[PDB]
Design a protein around this ligand. Structure first.
Ligand code: DYX
Length: 476
């Protein structure tokens, strides 16, 4: 009985039902991760996401060493590699954490067919989400809830959540891992260079990957529970929830019991419920990330403007607040939710009137904490393309951050070319007189671009555009 556990999400040894069940009754246990380096550059996956993943894999491998096992990293496509491994290792069991996202579901269905057609038993267990999303969808009558309010109703009628024991020496028991001395050069965790990324200009990651870092942060986050809010927090947990280094169910229980000790609203579960809601909404919708052909998405005639899109993506808008946020995102992989509101409003309903699909693709590349379902759901939501509950405040790309940080310390940290400007002009340097730009050694339009748009005029038009869209929807 040779059992293999396939890692994709759920990159942890705690609360891993699929791994626990696969281990039980197995003589052999082997943990695999599959990636192809040749397609790493063309997959819209940025270097920070790759680095966080590789660090997750190093931590899994290290933690597996403590249990006397090892992680197997295989280069290739899962449809091509799994037949060879079934025969090479005489696989009897294959286990995966369930993936609700449509393209992952189709991929897993193909792998399940090949495993079964080869006489391999397929173990699937839910642990990336709090609930069985198909059970939520059934309780809603076969269609996913279209509103956060309806979703909360169904969750409130759900039975209280049960977690799962951590994989230990006592859990593994008499289960072995076949290991060779050539293992590291054959199945070792890849470097970024192997994936084709230049690392010479890199600095240490602000968000270190892995289950160890996630559980260390969780204890400090529970202990603890402006301009400094914008900076990454050493107790932030959102990337670890996305990659599965931290179980959302464990996080839920720890939050509940700390709250019980401190004092049971959904104020503290709000982020997890939004996460759960977008997974539920996307799971049966293969065009969830599209406007055309997406049955839940308002059809809005967005501008097609690649040059403006590229200015926003590359932090070259000429609005330092917007550019500092997009620069933090590209450099670190995480920005504050209020900063996401700011740059996403600017791109779509606010200033540039560019499709939410284009912002989603940029965020997909650079953002560490948003799966496909959450990214698409969040972009449709903020652009009033789906899940509509109200019109939104139009954020000011100059004033909003100025009230956040009057001195512009956030601007100065991520846009060093502007550090010479005084606070009076740091958020609108195109208003600085010529002599002031010279002193700051930053000529607007040479060292830093001019503003790409007039916010007052653009936002005024776009606020009205959105109203007309929704007046049409009332008539239909
Ligand atoms: C703009 O692109 C993005 C903005 C946010 C995300 N994102 N990432 C995670 C989560 C979310 N989304 C949210 O929480 C909400 C949201 C939406 C839009 C904005 Cl602007 C801000 C918040 C959904 C409705 C209210 C809260 C929750 S999570 O753990 O599941 C990690 C992704 C892409």
């Amino acid at each position: 009985v040779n059992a293999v556990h396939w890692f994709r999400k759920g990159l942890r040894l705690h609360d891993n039902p699929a791994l626990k069940e696969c281990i039980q009754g197995a003589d052999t246990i082997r943990c695999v991760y599959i990636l192809d380096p040749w397609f790493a550059g063309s997959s819209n996956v940025g270097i920070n996401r790759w680095r966080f993943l590789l660090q997750c894999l190093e931590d899994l491998d290290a933690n597996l060493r403590k249990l006397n096992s090892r992680l197997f990293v295989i280069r290739g496509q899962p449809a091509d590699v799994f037949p060879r491994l079934f025969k090479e290792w005489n696989i009897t069991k294959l286990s995966i954490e369930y993936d609700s996202e449509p393209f992952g579901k189709e991929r897993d269905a193909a792998i399940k067919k090949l495993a079964t057609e080869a006489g391999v038993e397929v173990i699937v267990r839910i642990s990336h989400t709090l609930y069985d999303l198909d059970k939520i969808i059934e309780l809603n009558g076969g269609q996913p809830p279209l509103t956060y309010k309806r979703f909360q109703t169904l969750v409130s009628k759900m039975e209280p959540l049960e977690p799962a024991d951590t994989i230990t020496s006592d859990v593994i028991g008499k289960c072995m891992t076949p290991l060779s001395d050539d293992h590291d050069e054959k199945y070792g965790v890849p470097s970024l260079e192997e994936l084709g990324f230049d690392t010479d200009g890199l600095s240490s990651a602000v968000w270190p990957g892995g289950e160890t870092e996630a559980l260390t942060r969780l204890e400090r986050h529970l202990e603890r529970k402006n301009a400094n809010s914008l900076l990454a927090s050493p107790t932030g947990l959102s990337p670890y929830l996305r990659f599965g280094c931290l179980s959302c169910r464990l996080f839920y229980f720890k939050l509940t019991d700390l709250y019980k000790k401190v004092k049971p609203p959904l104020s503290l579960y709000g982020q997890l419920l939004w996460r759960e809601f977008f997974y539920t909404a996307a799971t049966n919708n293969p065009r969830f990330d599209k406007m055309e052909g997406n049955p839940i998405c308002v059809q809005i005639p967005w501008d097609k403007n690649p040059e403006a899109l590229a200015k926003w993506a590359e932090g070259r808008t000429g609005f330092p607040w917007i550019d500092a946020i997009m620069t933090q995102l590209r450099q670190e992989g995480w920005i504050h939710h209020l900063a996401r509101h700011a740059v996403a409003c600017f791109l779509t309903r606010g200033d540039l009137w560019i499709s939410w699909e284009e912002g989603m693709k940029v965020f997909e590349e650079l953002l560490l904490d948003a799966d496909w379902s959450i990214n698409a759901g969040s972009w449709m939501w903020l652009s009033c393309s789906s899940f509509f509950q109200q019109f939104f405040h139009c954020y000011c790309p100059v004033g909003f951050g100025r009230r956040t940080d009057p001195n512009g310390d956030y601007i100065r940290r991520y846009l060093p070319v502007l550090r010479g400007f005084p606070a009076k002009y740091i958020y609108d340097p195109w208003n600085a007189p010529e002599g002031i730009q010279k002193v700051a050694k930053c000529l607007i339009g040479v060292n830093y671009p001019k503003p790409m748009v007039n916010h007052a005029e653009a936002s005024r038009l776009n606020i009205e555009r959105m109203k007309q869209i929704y007046q049409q929807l009332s008539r239909y």
